[PDB]
Write a protein that binds this DNA or RNA. Structure first.
Lengths: 217, 129, 202, 158, 172
RNA sequence: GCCCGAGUGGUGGCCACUAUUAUUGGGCCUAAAGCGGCCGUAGCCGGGCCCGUAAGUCCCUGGCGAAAUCCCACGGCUCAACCGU
RNA sequence: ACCCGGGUAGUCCUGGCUGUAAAGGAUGCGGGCUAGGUGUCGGGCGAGCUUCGAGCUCGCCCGGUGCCGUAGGGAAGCCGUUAAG
């Protein structure tokens, strides 16, 4: 797909008007490095900042919706139903944002969520090293980590090459969107609650970088 | 009373760590802890310590770099063969890299990795990673 | 930083900067000079000279003008207003008009580079949004006020007008020294009185 | 530090001098110290109070530090000064004071029996004795043939 | 035994893979697919467990499992127990008799091939065979042919015509 | 139309799922669940420092835990199951 | 029956038995570690005041008894140096 890449980013860069200083420097082409937004902890306030980094072509921002829920609030002579939805933005290339959103209509929420998710993007650091030898690519996570969300306890474990994403489907969707090829998954405590389990996996893949190791040194 | 004085050292040391104080004070002190901090320093996990032996007790003031994540004693302190090491390897430690499952041994005291290079084993004492 | 001469030592001491009120807490204990025989705490006057210097530096640095001095105090809003006139940026509200930082749909929307708070206890909202945006935070802190989230300090009195005057004055001087217009070693072109407040009609 | 035993209340934090060798601005010979001790045990005072009066009057905080080394097998201190002379009670003072007190209780209860609380400390003091007995047997200040009882407490005191 | 079926058999993502695979290699039943998955699983499982253990344990165990994979041909000239785990259910399926018959150009297409070996229209070594599973070694590839056959005893069997119109081998 | 395929399904039993038996790897304010409180016997568990033994403990050697089944190789039966080395 | 007017056992004392509770803080006990603030009770200490008595107050410390709250835990309420960390 090649050059059509920047063309979506530049088409967004036709009418995108920066609210922030962050949205401005990105819209100027400065610090053209998502990673160089993360390290610094500069606030992802604009959705488009990201649309600037992820073109049509290379990483392929895999937008995906997990669960759509229908909830109610009882009101005077009324039930006011709405919808909550969980969406996953991610590149197989080692970024991910988990989003949930709530709305009266369905379509909107999808949209809301898709946006919500952008803000909460995260690097997952993968295992260069692997498990055994750093033969080529980061197949796994570096270290086993666990997630914590309400009742849910997810362990990610390093792995053999080819032994790929051995988790429940819900997480399996999120992980694939991360870019972990291979990972043992040890769950504990009710997953039925999708939103959390997901929040678990996300938190988990989040905590990757939060681990402080020796090879960093 | 106390028992496992080591452990009550270690556990401070970690809860100490998790806060992110600067240095530690451990009121009860010993060989076990002394030796273990020695081996710990040898791997590098910690900075420098001084113990002052008061007529009461040894006390260790320990310097905290930031390295340590988690370092804990073993409860019944199980005996572990050098073949069973790998099992106890996968369980307690976070991955193949770290290797201070500190055991006590015929040679002296060692980490896990310093134990394996010699080739000798025994009852577990504590962990560090 | 530099030794306490006069202007510096006669100025703080003549202005009631020293006189702090009730409560001490464990973190603040370091700036606290002495105990009176009553619960009224006295702040170290050296530390105020020291922590005002680096505060000319720290705010001469962020030279673009989106420094925001807010105040919940009735006393303080006048020194602040005058302070902002000199410098070149200020957010005025009695509150923060929350969504100053976090929201850009708000018709009053700024994007600061630094903040000055007057009372960490009243301006907690301005702090609340100072943790999210990612803004470093310099202030005036009392024997009663913590330093949680408060990363750089200027331990001074803020409960009274003379003081509330002196500080936003000497500071307006210091940052103009560093950036290079009027010095903190020359006597300031603006008088202290405007920053000083008075009640004729309410 | 504490032990809330038959209590919830944290124990006193009284703490020793961290001196490990003794003051020399204070001055006594191995011979002079020994006299002071023997004089006080002759009064009817007991070793804790003997160490107390020596502290308050002669300015020696603990005997061990001052004395040893003069036969460095171990620290030389009050009752180890006494035993070499034969002035030591064959019952350890610990165990003695305990039992001593105990016999006084019983007499109260004798006349007054409607006493919960007073009854309940009889139970609380015996059971410290029991322990203090139990281990001594094995250490050897009290023969293994002994066993504790309230008639064998009224015989040791008289 | 000699099969596997994952915890949940009707799952869509598992089933999709197969049906696409099912036409691709032209299996007769799913069991066949399974054979190779389950065979693949064992090599992986063992390769992995060996690499893991203390390096002093008679290395013969490793050698042995690298020897067979070389001989069979899945592994070419790579030296790590980690490449083994880098196989997939497609690679095994490339190694079959059926696949290898179409490849060389002994058959027009894999569906045709299913006919040939059954009626004994493919010889291997000196033997005929009936089982299209048959694991074909690398050394064994060079010895597939005709001799006492309906495809090649003459030059006017239409069979020869059917194979010639295509002339395309490759992954099945 | 989907699955599987000479099988496929029903009832029953066992194991998994069930960290719903917790060693690995569970809880116990209000969800089940703290004894109304204490004492101490049996038990388990134990501050520091030096020396002996080496009972546990680790290391090495040596006697030995039949064949079969299992796992790996090679070889045999068209293939594999199965068998042989 | 709630409401009202009479009324026995009991309620009190002595000796004995009986042994139950939303017998709660619905939170077993012991040790170590882990921001703080404030009020309060008792003990210590350095001062000022004094009626010359710690009588009135300031602060550090030790033991106890409440409330508020950081990090963390919790399903949430809440808990949070008197832990449910």
């Amino acid at each position: 797909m090649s050059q059509e890449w920047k063309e979506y980013a530049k088409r967004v860069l036709d009418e995108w008007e920066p609210k922030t200083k962050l949205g401005m420097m990105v819209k100027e082409g400065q610090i053209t490095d998502i990673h160089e937004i993360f390290r610094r902890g500069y606030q992802i306030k604009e959705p488009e900042i990201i649309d600037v980094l992820l073109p049509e072509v290379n990483a392929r921002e895999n937008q995906e919706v997990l669960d759509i829920a229908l909830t109610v609030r009882m009101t005077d002579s009324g039930r006011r139903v709405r919808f909550r939805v969980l969406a996953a933005v991610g590149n197989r290339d080692g970024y991910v944002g988990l989003g949930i959103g709530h709305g009266k209509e369905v379509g909107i929420a999808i949209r809301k969520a898709i946006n919500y998710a952008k803000l909460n993007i995260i690097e997952i650091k993968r295992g260069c090293g692997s498990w055994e030898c750093r033969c080529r690519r980061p197949h796994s996570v570096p270290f086993a980590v666990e997630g914590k969300e309400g009742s849910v306890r997810v362990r990610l474990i390093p792995g053999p090459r080819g032994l790929g994403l051995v988790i429940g489907d819900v997480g399996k969707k999120i992980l694939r969107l991360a870019g972990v090829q291979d990972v043992w998954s040890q769950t504990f405590g009710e997953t039925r609650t999708t939103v959390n389990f997901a929040k678990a996996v996300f938190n988990a893949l989040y905590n990757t970088n939060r681990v402080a190791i020796s090879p960093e040194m | 009373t106390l028992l496992d004085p080591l452990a009550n050292a270690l556990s401070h040391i970690t809860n100490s760590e998790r806060v992110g104080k600067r240095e530690v004070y451990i009121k009860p002190a010993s060989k076990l802890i002394g030796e273990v901090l020695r081996v710990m320093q040898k791997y590098g996990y910690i900075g420098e310590f001084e113990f002052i032996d008061d007529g009461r007790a040894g006390v260790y003031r320990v310097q905290l770099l930031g390295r340590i994540n988690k370092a804990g004693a073993i409860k019944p302190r199980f005996p572990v063969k050098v073949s069973e090491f790998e099992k106890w390897e996968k369980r307690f430690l976070p991955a193949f890299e770290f290797g201070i499952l500190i055991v006590s041994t015929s040679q002296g005291v060692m980490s896990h990795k310093e134990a394996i290079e010699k080739g000798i084993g025994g009852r577990l004492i504590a962990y560090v990673y | 930083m530099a030794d306490e001469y006069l202007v510096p030592l006669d100025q703080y001491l003549a202005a009631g900067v020293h006189i702090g009120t009730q409560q001490k807490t464990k973190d603040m204990k370091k700036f606290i000079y002495r105990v009176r025989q009553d619960g009224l705490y006295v702040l170290d006057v050296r530390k105020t000279d020291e922590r005002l210097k680096v505060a000319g530096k720290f705010l001469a640095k962020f030279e673009p003008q989106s420094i925001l001095a807010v105040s919940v105090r009735l006393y303080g809003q006048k020194p602040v207003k005058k302070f902002g006139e000199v410098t070149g940026a200020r957010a005025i509200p009695g509150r923060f008009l929350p969504g100053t930082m976090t929201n850009p749909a708000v018709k009053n929307f700024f994007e600061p580079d630094v903040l000055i708070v007057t009372d960490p206890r009243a301006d907690h909202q301005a702090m609340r949004e100072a943790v999210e945006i990612g803004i470093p935070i310099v202030a005036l802190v009392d024997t009663e006020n913590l330093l949680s989230y408060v990363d750089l300090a200027i331990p001074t009195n803020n409960k009274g007008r003379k003081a509330l005057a002196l500080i936003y004055w000497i500071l307006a001087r210091e940052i103009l020294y560093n950036r290079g217009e009027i010095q903190s070693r020359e006597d300031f072109k603006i008088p202290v009185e405007e920053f000083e407040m008075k009640i004729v009609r309410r | 530090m504490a032990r809330m035993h038959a209590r919830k209340r944290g124990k006193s934090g009284s703490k020793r001098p961290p001196r490990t060798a003794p003051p020399i601005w204070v001055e006594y010979t191995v011979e002079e110290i020994e006299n002071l001790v023997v004089k006080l045990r002759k009064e009817g005072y007991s070793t804790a109070m003997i160490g107390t009066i020596l502290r308050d009057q002669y300015g020696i905080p603990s005997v061990k530090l001052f004395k040893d080394p003069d036969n460095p097998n171990r620290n030389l201190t009050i009752t180890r000064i006494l035993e070499k002379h034969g002035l030591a009670p064959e019952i350890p003072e610990d165990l003695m004071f305990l039992i001593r007190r105990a016999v006084n209780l019983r007499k109260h209860l004798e006349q007054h029996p409607k006493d919960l609380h007073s009854m309940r400390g009889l139970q609380l003091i015996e059971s410290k004795i029991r322990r203090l007995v139990k281990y001594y047997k094995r250490k050897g200040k009290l023969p293994k043939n002994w066993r504790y009882d309230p008639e064998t407490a009224k015989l040791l005191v008289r | 035994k000699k099969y596997e079926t994952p915890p949940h058999p009707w799952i869509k993502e598992r089933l999709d893979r197969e049906r696409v695979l099912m036409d691709k290699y032209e299996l007769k039943n799913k069991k066949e697919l399974w054979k190779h998955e389950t065979q693949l699983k064992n090599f992986r499982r063992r390769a992995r467990r060996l690499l893991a253990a203390r390096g002093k344990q008679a290395e013969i165990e490793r050698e042995q499992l690298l020897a067979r994979l070389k001989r069979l041909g899945l592994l070419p000239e790579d030296a790590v127990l980690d490449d083994v785990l880098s196989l997939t259910i497609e690679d095994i399926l490339e190694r079959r008799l059926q696949t290898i018959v179409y490849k060389k150009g002994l058959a027009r297409t894999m569906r045709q091939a299913r006919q040939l070996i059954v009626h004994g229209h493919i010889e291997v070594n000196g033997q005929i065979i009936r089982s299209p599973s048959y694991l074909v070694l690398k050394e064994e590839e060079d010895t597939i042919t005709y001799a006492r056959t309906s495809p090649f005893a003459n030059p006017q069997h239409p069979e020869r015509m059917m194979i010639e119109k295509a002339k395309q081998g490759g992954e099945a």
